[PDB]
Design a protein around this ligand. Sequence first.
Ligand SMILES: Nc1ncnc2c1ncn2[C@@H]1O[C@H](COP(=O)(O)OP(=O)(O)O)[C@@H](O)[C@H]1O
Ligand SMILES: Nc1ncnc2c1ncn2[C@@H]1O[C@H](COP(=O)(O)OP(=O)(O)O)[C@@H](O)[C@H]1O
Ligand SMILES: Nc1ncnc2c1ncn2[C@@H]1O[C@H](COP(=O)(O)OP(=O)(O)O)[C@@H](O)[C@H]1O
Ligand SMILES: [Mg+2]
Ligand SMILES: [Mg+2]
Ligand SMILES: [Mg+2]
Lengths: 505, 505, 505
Amino acid sequence: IDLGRVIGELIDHRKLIISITSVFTLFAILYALLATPIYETDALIQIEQSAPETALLQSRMILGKTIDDLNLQIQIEQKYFPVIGRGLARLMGEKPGNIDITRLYLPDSDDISNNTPSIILTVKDKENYSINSDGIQLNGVVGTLLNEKGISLLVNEIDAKPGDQFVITQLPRLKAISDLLKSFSVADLGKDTGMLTLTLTGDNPKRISHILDSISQNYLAQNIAVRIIDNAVTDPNPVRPKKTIIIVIGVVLGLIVSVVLVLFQVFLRRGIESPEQLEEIGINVYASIPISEWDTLLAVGNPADLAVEAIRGLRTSLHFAMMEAKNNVLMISGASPSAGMTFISSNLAATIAITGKKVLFIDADLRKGYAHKMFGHKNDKGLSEFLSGQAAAEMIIDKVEGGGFDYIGRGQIPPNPAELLMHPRFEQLLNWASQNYDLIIIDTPPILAVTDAAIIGRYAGTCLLVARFEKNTVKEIDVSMKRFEQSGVVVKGCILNGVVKKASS
Amino acid sequence: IDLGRVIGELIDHRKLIISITSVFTLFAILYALLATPIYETDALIQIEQSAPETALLQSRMILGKTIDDLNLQIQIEQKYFPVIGRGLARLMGEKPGNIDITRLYLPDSDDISNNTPSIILTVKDKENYSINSDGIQLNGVVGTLLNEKGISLLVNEIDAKPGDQFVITQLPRLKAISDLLKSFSVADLGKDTGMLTLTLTGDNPKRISHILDSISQNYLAQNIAVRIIDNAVTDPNPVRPKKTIIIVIGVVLGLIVSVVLVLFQVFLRRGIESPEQLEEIGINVYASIPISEWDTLLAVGNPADLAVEAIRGLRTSLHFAMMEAKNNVLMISGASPSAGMTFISSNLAATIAITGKKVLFIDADLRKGYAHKMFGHKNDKGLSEFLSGQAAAEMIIDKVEGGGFDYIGRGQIPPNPAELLMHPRFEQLLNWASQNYDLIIIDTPPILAVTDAAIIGRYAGTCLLVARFEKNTVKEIDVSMKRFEQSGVVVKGCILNGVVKKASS
Amino acid sequence: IDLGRVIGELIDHRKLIISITSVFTLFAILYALLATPIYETDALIQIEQSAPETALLQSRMILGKTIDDLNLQIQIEQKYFPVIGRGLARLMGEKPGNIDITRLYLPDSDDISNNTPSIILTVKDKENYSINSDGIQLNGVVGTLLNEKGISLLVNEIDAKPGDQFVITQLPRLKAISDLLKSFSVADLGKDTGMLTLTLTGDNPKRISHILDSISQNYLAQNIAVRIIDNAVTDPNPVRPKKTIIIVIGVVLGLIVSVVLVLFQVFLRRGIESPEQLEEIGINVYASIPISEWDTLLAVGNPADLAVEAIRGLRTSLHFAMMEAKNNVLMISGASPSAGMTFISSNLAATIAITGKKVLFIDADLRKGYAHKMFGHKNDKGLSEFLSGQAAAEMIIDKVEGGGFDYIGRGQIPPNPAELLMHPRFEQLLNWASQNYDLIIIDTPPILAVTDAAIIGRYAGTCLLVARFEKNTVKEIDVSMKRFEQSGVVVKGCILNGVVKKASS
Ligand SMILES: Nc1ncnc2c1ncn2[C@@H]1O[C@H](COP(=O)(O)OP(=O)(O)O)[C@@H](O)[C@H]1O
Ligand SMILES: Nc1ncnc2c1ncn2[C@@H]1O[C@H](COP(=O)(O)OP(=O)(O)O)[C@@H](O)[C@H]1O
Ligand SMILES: Nc1ncnc2c1ncn2[C@@H]1O[C@H](COP(=O)(O)OP(=O)(O)O)[C@@H](O)[C@H]1O
Ligand SMILES: [Mg+2]
Ligand SMILES: [Mg+2]
Ligand SMILES: [Mg+2]
């Protein structure tokens, strides 16, 4: 391999790479702007050791005393239905509300799994609110305590706009202790000094400072039955999410997945890339027709098309190739269907007729031939009707309107096309036509599908295959040439079709 | 090797890979959803050392005192007959029952092996129950103690639905101590502090907490004749089984075993893959007939079949190959039986007869020939009867009904087929037929099995072998060609049969 | 590869390398001369340990006491609108001013983000000043305190020229402590001694010394409720930016990016470099025309041009190549447009006419031919009008004024150029002209674009291609030669055009 090839492949697939990288970067930006910020508060205490004090601070007694003091077993969560509602509310500048609950007691269903009872509180005004646990609706008022339906609740100082909802959960004490212990860290920072740094992370910058102050005070009171140097304060810059590293990771991930996909697609290509691939085997490529981005003939609708220019190049190439041929019959065929045989044949006939030579076009695709549709037709009396014997040699020839050449349609689809094409009346037709016309072009089905082309090619002076640019492979074209030679038909060469411009070439 | 080949092999064997991986993932999911959950309880004590205390806690004195206190020597197990009954009961939400037994004394058979006596208790109601040890049925009532048949039992507070069964075992004290010590761990967690973490795992989240509390209290009482900071609590999330890692391991195991099986099958393939394998040796492959997924002729029942199209391709190839041959006799043969010789020969005769040429078909498989069954027959007067001399040249020829060609059946199976085929009357028959027909096709047995084909091939102008797609190998076909040439028979080429579409090609 | 090639490439691209390196060095010099200088002050104290004292010095209590003492929470910044205004002011020798503020209290909006209120103070004279916070204009006087609009301010000892502006921010206490702690360092320097080195970096050489003295005094007073050996002094040489290393890094970065760009451009070149590239394939290069840096003929305006000398070399080469040719017709063509076909053909005709031979020039570029513009024209009756039949063979020939040869213009642009060129009247014209002139030169469109050149080349005795020096590639020229040979036209050789002098050759 070489650098030029890889750079060309990257240039060709630029749209895919850009789209994938942009999608990944957009997802990264959305996550980094919608993820909830996490603040960190710190405190510094002095040990008058410090190896067992790390375990004493994280023991369930200290944390449990803190949780009992601060009522951390009442989980209040602002209610947003979607997974991005909270982030959108924060971005729009909306101020989150809060409720001070000093007493909560749910009926404690305590089944096998749901060990955490929860209710939903809807704020109707600054004073009253509605409560629903499992569809049971109740009404409560700030101030006076509520003892109804096995539910006890005391709510103070609602701070939210009316219509807001809050999920109130009474999680078990061990769950609260585990959650507190997950986000709480103790370090020595000197490995020998009495200095201990206590760290607590959480999404509420004031609550975490209060929690760490309570932890420190409880530990201090417990020890004297240690010195608090730095009481806990919260860093106003969140520690998570780290937006810049997230976005950089997203961009690099997009680039690497795009490069992997591009390499995978490049290594899985088998189609023909250039005429030199065919010419390595020993197949003369007589032309390369580009894609015409422009039920009518292109050589007639848009005579100045680039594809028609390539076809004129093919015409002047054939005027020299088709010399010293046994007759004036040219047979266009191919390996696979929808390669361009009818396009090539019809347009070539048009470009050769505009130069003043009489041209006959025969649609010998007795199976899926649509030439009569493209030329303007009387569908009666096609090639089939002549071959089966129910027509004459003069009632099957029609004239293209915007063309300048005659044509013979397929006719009705027969049940035995390959056996009709073997009748000697076909050779009689070709011998008769080879005296009233200057050129005869025959369109045929593929050869890798059926055998009609190989029957027709016996009476053809020149035979050319059509290879589609990306679809067909060199193996298919070689197999087709060999199958034609096995049946006694000499293929003059190939015609690459549907070519497009690639920066890797 | 190259990446395209391996990707193609993976695409071809996709069904096998998917099935194996799905089976493994289903087994992993069943195990991860039916395995009994194992909870873990923890405690934290303070050592006022700690290297000998780990051995003192795990000594048999502390554990034995705990087991005597909590009666851990009475093993009560809920009875489910299958190995998945307990998991199903847990999944369906069924609440396990329990019995508080404060005194159990079994007769203690104490033979060589069964040192653990056991009984089965069936719950009939909230009060009474039935007991069976070795077929001896007894009835007991909660409350009043039972002393019968050398069995002492005191049962309190049955909690289960009627009809439940419980296995009650009186395991030896050392066995109970060993079981307790297997699931009990002590750690320092600081390597220098007085802090010891005690861990106990078990399937009953309350019993393990009680057991660890008893262990801690016994150690504390023993030492003062240490401080308990964190009394034991149980983590409600089970530590085993870890479902996600189990499922990931199952999926990866399925993928690796599937890839290994695929590679093993690929490396053990010897059959013909493409016509190019035969053409490397120098054997002209004249056709490749695909599998016809559609006692009748295919070229007649379904004339538009893909296989009949391939046979028409072979027909037009033969019309050119069979020129400049010494006569109009074609001999289809093969290497191994059930390769397609009769299929190819009969269908080829049909496709050549539909074009208006007189065709004779001869079934020279005098050993296992079934052509007369496929054509509609009068089984008398076949080839055998003519060769042995008990028939004429005109009483053996019959006509295929839906065909269009004549045929000669094998006749009765003779005892000496290879010696009948050497009679000059066979050559007389062929010389006579070569003047009344346009083509003669002869079907023969394989050549690697018997020698009839090599006797017949002396009088055949053209001879073609049939190679089955996956079954035969290049070695078999080369051996067959060489064995034909050794006997003076020139094989024109080969016919690949039963071809299917493979993404690795 | 070899050293000579790389040295030549470096010599050829010297201007690009010099420009890039100079730009990078200029940017580095601008940064190193405009970046604000950062001074460093040091102190040395003695510890009578020293592992916890590093944490005690950086604790928020000591730094907070210092900040409360020195009022470091009032941030005063000199106002320069651009990002280089301060550096320019320092370079021009301007003395920065300062204000001593002993009391500041802003309304403290304290919204979600802007936690730091700020005002702008404009100095009108040595006594009074103007204040604007959010468009609210106020006037204040040094001395008397200001308590207006929720803003309290006390300003003493303004030292600046009138018209200067100062941003006054009241940043939060924790922000001030964090900023102080970011630039403050403590080290032991012996790892065992009581000697501690305290370091403080800042842009004001006196303020940092005062700050470090206050830090040391506060720590000393705190400890005795330690010895100060070296009170803080400021190194007058700034520690940042380090100009020399910055400039060296800039120069080396410029050199490496220039070398990378040069290597990238060299590896992405595909055009023809020397005639030997064409002669490897087997194409005879008959000349190499250099660029003429000098609507007129070069061989006439500047007959002593270097390009005209190369064309005379081509003329004497052709006088030997064009012997034993079937006629006296020469056809200049090419692969891509704007290669030099009309330049080469017209100048060659001029140089061959100055030697006394009758020369005919034909502009057979019926699509974009501008020869009549370059020769002085009567645009009527060109080649088109003759071919279409509406003109005679004598009304189309005109005479070049400063030339010496006749010419035929294209005429009006036709709709069917390629089909006009196929008329036998073109061959009649050439046969008639081949008897009244000594040489006929025909200019043609490219061959990779259209097919006109291949139609004309049938009647041309000699055909030469023109390859542009850097534009065309060897692949294009080979494709053109092969496409000419496919149509029955033998190309004698090639002509390299637009050559320039490269030190890598
Ligand atoms: N270079 C081309 N540019 C534009 N359209 C093309 C080109 N080649 C083929 N086609 C069009 O795509 C369709 C398939 O080609 P067609 O020749 O009709 O199939 P087949 O090769 O089986 O006879 C046709 O409608 C054709 O007009
Ligand atoms: N390409 C094929 N498609 C469908 N059936 C086939 C094909 N080739 C052979 N068979 C069928 O499978 C059976 C075995 O083939 P057969 O020719 O009868 O055996 P043998 O080669 O020994 O004479 C037959 O019943 C045949 O009809
Ligand atoms: N060696 C050259 N020196 C100076 N000018 C040149 C040279 N070669 C071509 N040109 C000029 O650059 C332009 C493009 O060349 P031209 O021959 O007219 O295009 P084309 O090859 O398509 O006919 C012209 O104006 C030509 O005069
Ligand atoms: Mg078609
Ligand atoms: Mg058989
Ligand atoms: Mg030009």
